mmCIF file of C-alpha atoms in Angstrom:
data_model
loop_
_atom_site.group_PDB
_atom_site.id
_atom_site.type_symbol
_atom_site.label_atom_id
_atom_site.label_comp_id
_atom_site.label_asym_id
_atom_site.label_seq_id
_atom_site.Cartn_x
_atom_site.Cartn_y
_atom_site.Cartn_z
ATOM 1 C CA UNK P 1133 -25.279 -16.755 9.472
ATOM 2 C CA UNK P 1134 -26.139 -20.135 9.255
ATOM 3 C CA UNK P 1135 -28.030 -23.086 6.708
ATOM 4 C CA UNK P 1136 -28.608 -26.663 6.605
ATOM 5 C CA UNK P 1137 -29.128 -29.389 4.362
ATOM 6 C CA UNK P 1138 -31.593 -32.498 5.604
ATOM 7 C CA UNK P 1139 -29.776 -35.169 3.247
ATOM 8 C CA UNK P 1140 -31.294 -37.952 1.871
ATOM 9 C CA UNK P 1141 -29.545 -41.204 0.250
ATOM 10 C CA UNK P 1142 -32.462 -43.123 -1.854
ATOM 11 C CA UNK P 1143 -34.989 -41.112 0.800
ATOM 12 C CA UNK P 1144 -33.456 -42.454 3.877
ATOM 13 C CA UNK P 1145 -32.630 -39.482 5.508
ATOM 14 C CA UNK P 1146 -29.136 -39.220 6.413
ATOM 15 C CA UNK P 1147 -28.705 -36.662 8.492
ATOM 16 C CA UNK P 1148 -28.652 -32.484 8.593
ATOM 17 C CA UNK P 1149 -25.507 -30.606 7.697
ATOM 18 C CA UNK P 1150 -24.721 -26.565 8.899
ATOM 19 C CA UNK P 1151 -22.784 -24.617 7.242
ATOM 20 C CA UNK P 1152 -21.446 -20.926 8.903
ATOM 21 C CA UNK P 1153 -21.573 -18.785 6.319
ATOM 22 C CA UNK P 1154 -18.580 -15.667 5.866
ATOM 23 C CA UNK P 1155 -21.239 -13.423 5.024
ATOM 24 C CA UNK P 1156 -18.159 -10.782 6.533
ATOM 25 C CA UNK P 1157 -15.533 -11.606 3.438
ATOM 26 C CA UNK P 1158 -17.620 -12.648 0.686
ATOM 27 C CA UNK P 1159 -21.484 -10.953 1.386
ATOM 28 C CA UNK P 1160 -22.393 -11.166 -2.280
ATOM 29 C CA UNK P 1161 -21.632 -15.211 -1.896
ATOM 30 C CA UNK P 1162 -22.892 -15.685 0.996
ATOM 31 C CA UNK P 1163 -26.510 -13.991 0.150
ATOM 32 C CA UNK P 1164 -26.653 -16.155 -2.663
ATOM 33 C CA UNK P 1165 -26.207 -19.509 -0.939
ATOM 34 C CA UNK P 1166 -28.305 -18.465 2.071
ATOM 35 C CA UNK P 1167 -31.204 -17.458 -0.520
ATOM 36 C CA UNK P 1168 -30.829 -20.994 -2.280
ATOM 37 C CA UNK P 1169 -31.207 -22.522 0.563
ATOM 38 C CA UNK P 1170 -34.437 -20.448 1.938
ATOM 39 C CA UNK P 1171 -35.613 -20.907 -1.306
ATOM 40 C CA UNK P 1172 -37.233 -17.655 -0.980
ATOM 41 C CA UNK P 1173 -36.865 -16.308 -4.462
ATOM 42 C CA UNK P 1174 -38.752 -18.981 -5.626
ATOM 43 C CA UNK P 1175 -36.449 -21.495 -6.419
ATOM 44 C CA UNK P 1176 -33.744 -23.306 -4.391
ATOM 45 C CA UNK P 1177 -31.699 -26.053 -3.581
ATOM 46 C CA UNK P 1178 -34.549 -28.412 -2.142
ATOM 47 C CA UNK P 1179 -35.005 -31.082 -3.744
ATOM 48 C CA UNK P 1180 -31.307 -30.792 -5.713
ATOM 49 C CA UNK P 1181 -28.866 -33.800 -5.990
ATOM 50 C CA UNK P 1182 -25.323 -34.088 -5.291
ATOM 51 C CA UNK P 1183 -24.680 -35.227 -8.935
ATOM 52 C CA UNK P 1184 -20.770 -35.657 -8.318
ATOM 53 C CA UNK P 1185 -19.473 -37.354 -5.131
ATOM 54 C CA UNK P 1186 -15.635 -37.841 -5.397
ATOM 55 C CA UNK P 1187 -14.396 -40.026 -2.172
ATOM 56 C CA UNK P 1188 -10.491 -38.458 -0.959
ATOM 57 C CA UNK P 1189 -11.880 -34.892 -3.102
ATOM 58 C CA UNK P 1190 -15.093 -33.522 -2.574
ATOM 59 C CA UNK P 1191 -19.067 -33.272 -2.765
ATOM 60 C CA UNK P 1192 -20.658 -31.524 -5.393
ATOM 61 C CA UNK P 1193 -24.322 -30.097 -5.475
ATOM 62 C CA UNK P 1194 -26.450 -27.087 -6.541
ATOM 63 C CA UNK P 1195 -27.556 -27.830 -10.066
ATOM 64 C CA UNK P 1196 -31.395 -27.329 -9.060
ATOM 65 C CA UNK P 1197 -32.484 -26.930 -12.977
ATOM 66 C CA UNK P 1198 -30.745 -29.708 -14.186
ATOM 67 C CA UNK P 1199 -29.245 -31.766 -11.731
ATOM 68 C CA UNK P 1200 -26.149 -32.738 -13.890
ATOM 69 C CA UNK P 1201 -23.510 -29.896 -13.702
ATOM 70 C CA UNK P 1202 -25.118 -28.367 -16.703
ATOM 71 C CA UNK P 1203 -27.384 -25.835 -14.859
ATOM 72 C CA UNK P 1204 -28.034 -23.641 -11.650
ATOM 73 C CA UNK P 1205 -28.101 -20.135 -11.697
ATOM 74 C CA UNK P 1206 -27.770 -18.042 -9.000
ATOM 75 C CA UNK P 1207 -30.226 -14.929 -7.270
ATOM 76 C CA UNK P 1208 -28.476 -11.706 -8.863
ATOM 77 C CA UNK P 1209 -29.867 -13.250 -12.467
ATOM 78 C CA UNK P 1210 -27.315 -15.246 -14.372
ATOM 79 C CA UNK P 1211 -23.942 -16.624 -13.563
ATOM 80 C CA UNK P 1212 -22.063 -13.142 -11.318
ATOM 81 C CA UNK P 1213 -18.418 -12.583 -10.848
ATOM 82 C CA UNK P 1214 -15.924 -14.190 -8.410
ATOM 83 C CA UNK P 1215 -16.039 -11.703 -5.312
ATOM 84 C CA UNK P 1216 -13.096 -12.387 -4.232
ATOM 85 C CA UNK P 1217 -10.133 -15.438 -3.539
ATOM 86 C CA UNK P 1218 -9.242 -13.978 0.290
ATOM 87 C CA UNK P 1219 -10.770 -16.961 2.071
ATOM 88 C CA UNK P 1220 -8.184 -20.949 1.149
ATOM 89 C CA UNK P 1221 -9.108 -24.787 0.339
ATOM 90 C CA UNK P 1222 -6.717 -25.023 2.800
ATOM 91 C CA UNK P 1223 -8.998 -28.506 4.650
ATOM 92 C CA UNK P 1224 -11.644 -30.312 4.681
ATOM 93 C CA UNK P 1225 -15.268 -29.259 5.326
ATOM 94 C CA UNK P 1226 -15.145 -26.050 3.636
ATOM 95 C CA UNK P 1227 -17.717 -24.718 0.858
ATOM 96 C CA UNK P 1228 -16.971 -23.185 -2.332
ATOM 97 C CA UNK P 1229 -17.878 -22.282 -5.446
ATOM 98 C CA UNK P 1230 -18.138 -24.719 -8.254
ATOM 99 C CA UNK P 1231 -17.701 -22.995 -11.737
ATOM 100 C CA UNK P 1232 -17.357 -23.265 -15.671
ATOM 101 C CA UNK P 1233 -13.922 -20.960 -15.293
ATOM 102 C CA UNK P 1234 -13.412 -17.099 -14.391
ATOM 103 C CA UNK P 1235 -16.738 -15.313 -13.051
ATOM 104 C CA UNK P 1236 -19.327 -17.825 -13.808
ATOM 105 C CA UNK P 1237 -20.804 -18.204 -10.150
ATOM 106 C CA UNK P 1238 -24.147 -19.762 -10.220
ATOM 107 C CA UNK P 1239 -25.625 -21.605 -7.742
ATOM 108 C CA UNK P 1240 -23.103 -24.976 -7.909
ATOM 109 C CA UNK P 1241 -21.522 -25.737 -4.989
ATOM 110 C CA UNK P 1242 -18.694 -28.151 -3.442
ATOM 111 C CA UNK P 1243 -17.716 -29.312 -0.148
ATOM 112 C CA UNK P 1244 -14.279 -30.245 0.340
ATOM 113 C CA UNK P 1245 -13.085 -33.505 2.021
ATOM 114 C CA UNK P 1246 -9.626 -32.659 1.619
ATOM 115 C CA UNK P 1247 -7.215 -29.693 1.488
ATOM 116 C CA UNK P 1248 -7.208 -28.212 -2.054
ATOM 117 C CA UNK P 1249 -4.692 -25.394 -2.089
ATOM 118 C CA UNK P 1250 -4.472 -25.545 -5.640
ATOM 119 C CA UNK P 1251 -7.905 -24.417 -6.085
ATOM 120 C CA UNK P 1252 -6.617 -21.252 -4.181
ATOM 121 C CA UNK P 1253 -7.469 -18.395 -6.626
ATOM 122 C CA UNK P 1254 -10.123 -19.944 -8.737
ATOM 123 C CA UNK P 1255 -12.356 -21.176 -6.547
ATOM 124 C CA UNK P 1256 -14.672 -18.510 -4.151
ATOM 125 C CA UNK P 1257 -14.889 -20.754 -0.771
ATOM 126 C CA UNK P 1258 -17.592 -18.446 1.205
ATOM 127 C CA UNK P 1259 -18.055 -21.166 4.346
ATOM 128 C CA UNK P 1260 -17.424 -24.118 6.621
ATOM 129 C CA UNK P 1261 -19.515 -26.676 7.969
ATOM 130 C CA UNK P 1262 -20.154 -26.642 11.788
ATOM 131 C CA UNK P 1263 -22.591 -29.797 12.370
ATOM 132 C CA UNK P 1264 -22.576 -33.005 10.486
ATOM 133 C CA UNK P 1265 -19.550 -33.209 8.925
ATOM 134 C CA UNK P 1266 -20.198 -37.192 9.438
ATOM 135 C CA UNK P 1267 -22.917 -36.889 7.257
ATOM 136 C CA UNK P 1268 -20.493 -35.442 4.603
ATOM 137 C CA UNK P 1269 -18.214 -38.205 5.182
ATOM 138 C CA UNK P 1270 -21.201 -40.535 5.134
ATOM 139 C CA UNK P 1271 -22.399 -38.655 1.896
ATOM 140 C CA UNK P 1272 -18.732 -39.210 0.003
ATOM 141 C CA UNK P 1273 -18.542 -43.029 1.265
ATOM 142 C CA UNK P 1274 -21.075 -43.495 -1.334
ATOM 143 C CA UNK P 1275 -19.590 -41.645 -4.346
ATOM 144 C CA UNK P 1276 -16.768 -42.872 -6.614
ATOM 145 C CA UNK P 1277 -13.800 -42.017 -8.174
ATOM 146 C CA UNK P 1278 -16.398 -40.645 -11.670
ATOM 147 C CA UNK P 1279 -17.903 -38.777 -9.135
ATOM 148 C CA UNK P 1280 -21.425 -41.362 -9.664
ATOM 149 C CA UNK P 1281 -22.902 -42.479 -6.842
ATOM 150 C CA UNK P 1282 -25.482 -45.937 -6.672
ATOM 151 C CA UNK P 1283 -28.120 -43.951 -4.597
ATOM 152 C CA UNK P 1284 -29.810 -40.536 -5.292
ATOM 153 C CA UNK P 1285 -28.575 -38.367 -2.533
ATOM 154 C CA UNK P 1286 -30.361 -35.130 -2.075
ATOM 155 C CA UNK P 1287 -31.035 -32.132 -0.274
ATOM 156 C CA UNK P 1288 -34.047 -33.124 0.851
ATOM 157 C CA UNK P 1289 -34.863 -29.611 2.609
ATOM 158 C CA UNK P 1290 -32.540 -26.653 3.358
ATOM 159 C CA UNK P 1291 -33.320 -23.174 5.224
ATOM 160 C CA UNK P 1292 -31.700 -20.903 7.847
ATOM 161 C CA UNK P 1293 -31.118 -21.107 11.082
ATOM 162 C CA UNK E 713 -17.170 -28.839 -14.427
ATOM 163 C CA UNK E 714 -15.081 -27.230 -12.236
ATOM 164 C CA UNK E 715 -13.096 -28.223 -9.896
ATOM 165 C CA UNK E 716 -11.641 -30.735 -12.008
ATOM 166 C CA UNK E 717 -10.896 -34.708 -10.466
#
């Protein structure tokens, strides 16, 4: 199982980032990422910003309602539990579940540029990417240490492959 | 907010 992002800095497109999904450890998570990214429900991550880009850290995306950290909700309704804490931060290039604290998955997601083993257990990581990880790097290059970046980088379209 | 960075 396998998405993309088409990113865009300030419409330039930058580039198209795949993601393998463990639809095997964490289905629930999985669904609900590969959904967002279809946008078949209705609603989706085209169109969303990466509203927090934190060079040496991570990317962080998914607020498609709000765009600020504030909103995003995910397929199953609201927010749904954390399925489970099998799969580590243990490098870079891994995706995971951004959240407001114990079970309150939405549709928020990050993409780690660094290990983050202390995430380990409160964090749902449910994939890695497998094409364009320079585009990531490109991506965090333009972020700061707030996590504000000078150009609007998007996903300009997403889907399945 | 989360992860915190």
């Amino acid at each position: 199982s396998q998405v993309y992002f088409d990113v865009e800095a300030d419409g330039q497109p930058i580039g198209r980032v795949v993601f393998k999904l463990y639809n095997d450890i964490v289905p629930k998570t999985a669904e609900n990422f590969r959904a967002l990214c279809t946008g078949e429900k209705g609603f989706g991550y085209a169109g969303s910003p990466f509203h927090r880009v934190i060079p040496d850290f991570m990317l962080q995306g998914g607020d498609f309602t709000a765009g600020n950290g504030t909103g995003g909700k995910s397929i199953y309704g609201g927010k749904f539990p954390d399925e489970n804490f099998k799969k580590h931060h243990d490098r870079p290039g891994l995706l995971s579940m951004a959240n407001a604290g114990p079970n309150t998955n939405g549709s928020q997601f990050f993409i780690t540029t660094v290990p983050c083993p202390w995430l380990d257990g409160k964090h749902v990581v449910f994939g890695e990417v497998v094409d364009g990880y320079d585009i990531v790097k490109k991506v965090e290059s333009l972020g700061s240490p707030s996590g504000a970046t000078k150009a609007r980088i998007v996903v300009a379209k997403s889907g399945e492959l | 907010a989360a992860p915190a960075x």
